[PDB]
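Thought: the user asked what Haloalkane dehalogenase looks like in 3D. I have the sequence; next I should run the structure tool and report back without guessing.
Action: structure_tool
Action Input:
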Amino acid sequence: SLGAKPFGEKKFIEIKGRRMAYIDEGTGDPILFQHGNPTSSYLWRNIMPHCAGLGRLIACDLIGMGDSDKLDPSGPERYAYAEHRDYLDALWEALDLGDRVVLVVHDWGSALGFDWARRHRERVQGIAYMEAIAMPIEAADLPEQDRDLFQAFRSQAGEELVLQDNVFVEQVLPGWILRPLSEAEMAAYREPFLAAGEARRPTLSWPRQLPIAGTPADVVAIARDYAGWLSESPIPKLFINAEPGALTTGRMRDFCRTWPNQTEITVAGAHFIQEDSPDEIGAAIAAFVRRLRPAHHHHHH
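Observation:
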């Protein structure tokens, strides 16, 4: 359904001196849901219940986000992609996931999850993805109404816009959801970022990492690598396309449609499509997992 209550409860594991928070409900092989910017495990609260009984339902909060600890010191060099990957790789190792992981990814959750899959390909049973960073992009790949703002985040205006005014949480997030949010839903997204200053740094470092027009070169190389790998990978895929969409439209949507062994649905939504069409998304993920994990609870006629 479309509710404001979180799914499950937060567990915590010590990673590199910091506590990281995650949901881990049920038993079986993992179904691993990964949020991006400026969200948390809360993004998946109405999608995860559709997979009840199909596996261990896991949703991690990235470092500095959700209920995971902040890094200190923090500043313009903090919370880059490589640092997020170091913390997330460690958490995923600590979780003892095994070799039949279904990844469910969004946004920077897709850049992190796709790269992890490339590096652990025998351990990935299937990949469900939506509104993803599927390859290096140009400004033209962002919605026209958002291009100037993303260029502003990447400029020296970003500190005031984000650290002081919290614009990613307060403007970009509700602006990329079709329906109006309740106060409880906005409060759950605001909670990690209530405090001005470096507490909000992850939400500024993330747009500065987007691989746009060849910069930053290190993230561009990472996305080039996983794009080339995904386009030839036999791993089963579920593409949750969105209309109008935001990050995965036009030529990026066309590129994703070339990927092999892939099923597709289209749901209503812009970027944070989990807030507009959670039941359709969850039902498609559940059907995908049931196909990958045939349970044979009953005779087939």
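Thought: the tool returned a structure. Summarizing for the user.
Final Answer: Structure for Haloalkane dehalogenase predicted. The chain has one domain: 1-301. The longest helix spans residues 278-292.
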